[PDB]
Amino acid sequence: AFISSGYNPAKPMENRITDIGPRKFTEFFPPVIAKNAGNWDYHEILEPGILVHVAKNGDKVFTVRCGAARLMSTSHIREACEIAKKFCNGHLRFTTRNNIEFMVDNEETLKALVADLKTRKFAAGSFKFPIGGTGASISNIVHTQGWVYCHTPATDASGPVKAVMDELFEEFTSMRLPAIVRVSLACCINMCGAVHCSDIGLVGIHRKPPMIDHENLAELCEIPLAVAACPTAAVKPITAEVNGQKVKSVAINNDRCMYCGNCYTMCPALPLSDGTGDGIAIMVGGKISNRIKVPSFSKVVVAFVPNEPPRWPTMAKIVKKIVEVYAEDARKYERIGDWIHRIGWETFYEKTGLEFSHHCIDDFRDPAYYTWRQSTQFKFVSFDS
Amino acid sequence: AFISSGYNPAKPMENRITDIGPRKFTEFFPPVIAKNAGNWDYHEILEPGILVHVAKNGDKVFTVRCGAARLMSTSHIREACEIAKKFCNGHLRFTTRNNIEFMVDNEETLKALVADLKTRKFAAGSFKFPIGGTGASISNIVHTQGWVYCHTPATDASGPVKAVMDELFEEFTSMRLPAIVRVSLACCINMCGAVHCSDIGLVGIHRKPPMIDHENLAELCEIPLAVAACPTAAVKPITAEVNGQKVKSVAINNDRCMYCGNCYTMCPALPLSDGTGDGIAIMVGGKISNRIKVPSFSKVVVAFVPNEPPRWPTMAKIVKKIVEVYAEDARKYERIGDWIHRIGWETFYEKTGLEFSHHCIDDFRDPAYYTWRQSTQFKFVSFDS
Amino acid sequence: KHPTPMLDELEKGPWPSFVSDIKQECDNRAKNPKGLDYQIPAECPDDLLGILELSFHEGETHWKHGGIVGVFGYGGGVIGRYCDQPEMFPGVAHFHTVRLAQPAAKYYTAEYLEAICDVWDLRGSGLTNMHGSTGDIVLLGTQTPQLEEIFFEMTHNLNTDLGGSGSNLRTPESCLGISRCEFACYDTQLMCYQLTQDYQDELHRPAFPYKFKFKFDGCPNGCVASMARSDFAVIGTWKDDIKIDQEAVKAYVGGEFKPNAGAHAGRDWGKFDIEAEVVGLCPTGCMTYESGTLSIDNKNCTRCMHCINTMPRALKIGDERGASILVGAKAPVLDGAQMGSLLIPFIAAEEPFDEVKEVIENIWEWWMEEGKNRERLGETMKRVGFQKLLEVTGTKAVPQHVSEPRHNPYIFFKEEEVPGGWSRDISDYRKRHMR
Amino acid sequence: KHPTPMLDELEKGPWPSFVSDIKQECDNRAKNPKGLDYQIPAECPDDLLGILELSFHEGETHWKHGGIVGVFGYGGGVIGRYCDQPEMFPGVAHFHTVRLAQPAAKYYTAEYLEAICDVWDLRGSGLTNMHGSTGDIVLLGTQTPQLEEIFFEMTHNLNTDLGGSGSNLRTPESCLGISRCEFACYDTQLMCYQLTQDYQDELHRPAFPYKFKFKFDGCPNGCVASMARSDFAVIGTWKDDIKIDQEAVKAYVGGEFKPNAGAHAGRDWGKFDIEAEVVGLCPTGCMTYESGTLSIDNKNCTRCMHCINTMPRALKIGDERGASILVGAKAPVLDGAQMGSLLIPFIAAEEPFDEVKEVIENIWEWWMEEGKNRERLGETMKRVGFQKLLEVTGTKAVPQHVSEPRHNPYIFFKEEEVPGGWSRDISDYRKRHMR
Amino acid sequence: AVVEFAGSAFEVDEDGFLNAFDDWCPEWVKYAKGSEGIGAGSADHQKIIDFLQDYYKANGIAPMVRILSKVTGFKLKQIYELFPSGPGKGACKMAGLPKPTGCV
Amino acid sequence: AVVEFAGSAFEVDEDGFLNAFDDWCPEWVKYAKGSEGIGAGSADHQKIIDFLQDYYKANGIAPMVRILSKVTGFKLKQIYELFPSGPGKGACKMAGLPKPTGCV
């Protein structure tokens, strides 16, 4: 049957409520937070995934951080709520990296909560609420839609993310790194998320120019929009033929096209998706905090790795290698970007064993010149052999 | 009156000798140099303006470096030859900063040479061959033509240089700075010389768009060349009418013109110089050597100071102020750029007392973004009061 | 359909499997324990798995280009999507995403979340994204007829509105701020909440050249990454001195208090060394450690947070607090990635936040008129110049605005600041200089 | 003589006055004690002062735009110039400058310079520039008719050629190199001399899209500033270990030897502190000083020259020498200043330098065809891409080619690299994805 | 699909936009009213439709909201009062223009 | 200055270039003929002049050296053998084109 909410399609503007925004955060605060907000004295990381904050008046609030898949069901949300109601008086929150945090005001409840969380697993096997993500570790991965929902991807998001966190799980439940290692993935160059400011960034990219649907382009597309959408000016207006007649369309110079797909974003008659052509570019060295060194962009170190569902072994292996070498060679407090700035790029490649390609050398506009080396300072590596 | 060399203007190509290049350096080498070239052991700076090199076999060559105006008469060049004939068997050389060096093989001859040089002054009183320019000092000033010979200058070269060296004479005859301080000047933004890579750079700049001689431009200019000569695309081809006459010409969008004068270089019908409009922009922080820090460009810290012949007081005082603050606040081995990198820009302005203006903020193309501050890291200074 | 060999592989491993989670919801909808009368196919999630499995085999997405759906009165908030195989996967023929406005810093009660889940189970796929990267609660997948139904129940029963999408103001978000952090320089959540309400019109009805984002960080550590992922970033700081308790300093040196609150306990780095881990790493070298006493030359402190981060029980933020405004951050398309560029070094950060709002509104007044079509603020800044941004916000240029002054001499001047102006007569010039 | 109130002021002060010197030459030509029949006006320098004085008064140059003069056979070498008040200053109506080829590193003998002066006094103004910025001996001021007479004498009597000017390969120059420096990694003067002789035709006849320059430094100290002032910069270095004299090291620590060979002697910096002045300043921190022994991890040495510069008597350059090639340096116009970008990290630099010449000619073959009108190599690189430069020079890409990898994903692939090429049929695509 | 109304045929997509702008007819508007929450067509509605159609023909793209408001003299609030779904899904759809693209 | 040759009058600058391209005529070539080291004009000297003039009229500029050589087929060396002053001061001056500008 049609179960109505009360909305009247015949009189859509009748009883319409608008511009109310979200509920105020204050309505959902745990009592200990609401009371001591702004009066915190200090904090302490007790274990991987467990925090304690102490207010000026002595009150304490313990936080248990749990990893989550971001893409989740209502059933899973209801389970977090079940746990929240059982140990936290119905309270909980989500972090800026999509982990879940449960808070309690006393040690004994904390122990009970923690003991309970460790017993929750899926049939298949996987942990439902793995405790961790604090301190010098790898806490989840900021990611996108991929093949789950978007039309412009060059790769998947949930799949790769699951494969990478599985291989780095030991890094999530421990605090053994020189500093936090932020990982992020974006399924296309629009780069939603934080790929451009993370220690390791994964971005989906294409290697083939878009296909042109001349018969419908001028019907479905605002040509000036497709032309202006090209960073390298590879799109130009042209006359084409359809059924022998004259029609307005666009022409793409494959020599100026770097397959970003922005023209497709603006025009549905310029698809470029491709199973063998699409893959992932790997970046490293970015950060957003201002701790010691200023924030920085992540840099492309591996121009392309093929898509290999469901576990992307080649890509996963590259990420692991970088983390291992970095963790073994960097000094305390050094972010991947810090480390590389200290040892030098040639040394980075030498130590990681990653092959360097001219594809990593910037060639986009005048700023490109700055990425080149205007100094005699360089170290001899096997690359010079 | 006319005295022939042997050339025959009636047969210009007969007996013409071409492509012989310069004389070979070895033909002018002093004996001690020719003998130990490439066999040097070490060197040491004996006194300000005096050096000694010691070969691996023991031989020694002493060098006396003297300041020079660069722009000189044949009489001065002959007086330098007279000196070399007297103490150096006729040998002498010029440095890459246009100072003159005399070389001898023994300490007694050296002492005699130095005493003599110090006995040479012009009638007006200026030293003809002042000794110095070595170690952490302020050696000669790399400069250009100015009003002495060029058609595109916005300021003079010889005048300012003489005025500045007169102020910085102590620093040439002594070695009390944290590191070398190179000063260079360019008569216009073509920046011939080393302005863009000096500790202190001086460049003449205009502040007014070019005047356009519409009546004669066509005949005098290759239009397309003037159009392509503009970095901001201020110039476009137009069909103009002067005195009821149709003539090809160009139009300048004064809103896109930053008075670089490149269009004039390509077209005589677009003169721009202006007595009150022209002046000098002051730059600091550049260096070319790769010692410790990589080379760097000098940066504009004072967008404009007026031309004030014949001694440019305003400009000269600021230069001296920079050197004084630097000399006092910089650490050993710190070049002016090294110094500003350590203390920070707001601190530099705070110590020097120099006014900061929006004109110093880069606004030229995509690369300008990189000159802005993308970090929360800054110090509070009187600027924020 | 149901046969999903590739996806099944992703049910292995320790990390919570989205596949196992989606399969549980499929089983739940098939069982329908609560006798719900699902308003979209009960098998919606089942077909999601089937089409995802297909994409895994072909290595290619199966969602048609874009889609334009929504609710009356708003110009955004819902990202429509149609699968490109309707016949093979009717369950996701329509699979719209609804962006729901979330409470600041994402604090929730079970009662609230369950109420949301009740509405979505009945009118949606039962799948979600617990928080899209901008902050919104994401309801993943529904059919067009349910959009108005869901909006009605959300507003009327849950007092909850939609989030933002399109060329307007997107959903703002903040770090947890003063709610549970001792480094917080201002109430990030309250500022986020107030401005979100203040600019509801600009968020629901696209009136901008393009998208615009707000993000609020309590301090430079950037827990919500504002100066990377927002056009207008507010990052708290202080203007006075770092507070130092020598007694606490001694506890760190003695080993009683662990560096960085124990963030590095998983590896034996050795006993704390204040000299090598704090004094020696300070970017400005403005710290001193002598005769057992720690000092900081605050005038030369850039407040990068490192020392405080490392000895949080001994070093505290100052009392004279406010924030900095950095603008123009964006992802690459079109002209290149950009992080926030400092605009206002220090500004008041207390409700009703009039000072901050004034900068916001001055920027919009200018950008809404001068910005080219779908040009981000960051790109308008590059095109038109930082100088212009300063003028429209009434901000005086200061050294703090640059990481480096210009090294090109292409300096523009205002005619009015040049004696004589720009109108010159070539014939007069010709009197001093013969052709 | 013309009254010169302003220039007279520049006769005061300690620094050698260019005015007093010019005046002396005016005096000299006035007395003419040799009885020369001056080929241009004896009062040439007098009018030069007069017009310079005029310029000081009006603050504006008095030289007409450009000028086109020279000698048969060459397309450059002489910069024409005519004053714009010939009536007022006849003596400089014609005031052409002649660029004369100078010996490498400017070593001279009195006899040679004197012979040049003899020629100039007779056919010139008596005024010179002892070496323009590029290196040429500059003869400042003469008339058109004297150009061929001067050229005849220079080539037939003094065996000396003209320098370069225009859109070709300009006069090359080097640091003094091995002639009087223990840091020189190769014979800079010889390479300079040989290459100047080798490309005489490219230097005398414009065949390039624009000007092109060579400069050669003996080591990274850049005494001729090659990587800032030449399109093709050759900078010496080594690839083996730095030579360390432990006994000499003790001499520095003990105070016998002065740091940096006594370059900071005019000021008191305290006693030498090897850790603070050397080890701790090393860019890579690859140095070690333990138990009175100095050690260097050459593998991590970028050979920046600092330690060697500071302890010249204790630290020497390696024995396996060569040079680095950096290209593209240029002054700002049009697109902006550029410094040399590293192209060949290490290349052999021994007579007759074939390997170096190979790179040169490969770059020319490319740039001569691809460079736009009046576009410097550096600019062509920016426009066409560094990768292109690598291809035409047969240079393999290495991490050493960047200061930092790209941070944008706009990556170009060659069709041959991508399986399936770029020829696709949207028809087959629709087979899997319905519109 | 193809909308059949008042003896006219209109090829549309899943969102209701005309696949071909040229197929636009006054009937299209009368047909779309309901779905776009419009009871009666006013001269003000027409003024906007005409503007959108003119701009598109002239520039090949839909006009920016600021331009739509500038020329018509209708502020955004008014635009929504006339077209509840907004300038895009509402006015442009009814003006026969192609479906809007880009990140919403 | 004002030139008087073969009953013709040419306006010239200090360098010997015609102040106005339109004032070019064969008489001119015969005038500057010797001042450019050329005793007799050949079919080749003409082919170059013709090309330069056609180019200028078509592009508003003198052609790059590489283009002059590519079209005429004359190598740089040959150009100089024909015009000892080179393509600029020699050919362009004789072809009636305006004086070269830039560095040198």
Ligand code: SRM
């Ligand atoms: C859903 C979400 C990804 C996720 O799974 O987390 C997302 C999804 C899309 N983004 Fe975004 N962006 C999301 C966070 C971001 C962020 C990060 C942030 O806001 O914190 C960025 C970087 C910051 C920025 O604004 O630049 C981001 C930068 C972009 C861009 C590049 C804009 C630019 O100027 O460079 C595009 C492309 C465009 O707008 O044309 C884009 C385009 C898109 C579209 C609307 C593409 C389209 O036409 O359909 C994507 C819809 C996918 C889908 O099917 O639902 N999205 N996007 C994120 C939703 C947040 C929310 O709470 O609603």
Ligand code: SF4
């Ligand atoms: S894919 Fe990208 S680079 Fe190729 S044509 Fe489209 S917008 Fe231009």
Ligand code: SF4
């Ligand atoms: S002066 Fe420079 S910026 Fe102004 S029109 Fe001439 S070329 Fe362009």
Ligand code: SF4
């Ligand atoms: S941005 Fe600062 S104030 Fe906000 S949660 Fe992170 S550390 Fe605490």
Ligand code: SF4
């Ligand atoms: S906050 Fe950073 S800049 Fe200031 S003293 Fe601590 S470490 Fe040094």
Ligand code: SF4
């Ligand atoms: S560049 Fe090196 S080799 Fe040449 S003079 Fe300078 S220090 Fe000696």
Ligand code: SF4
């Ligand atoms: S030459 Fe520079 S990089 Fe190598 S050891 Fe000496 S100071 Fe360190």
Ligand SMILES: O=S([O-])[O-]
């Ligand atoms: O492809 S959809 O937007 O019709």
Ligand SMILES: O=S([O-])[O-]
């Ligand atoms: O101005 S000159 O070149 O005739």
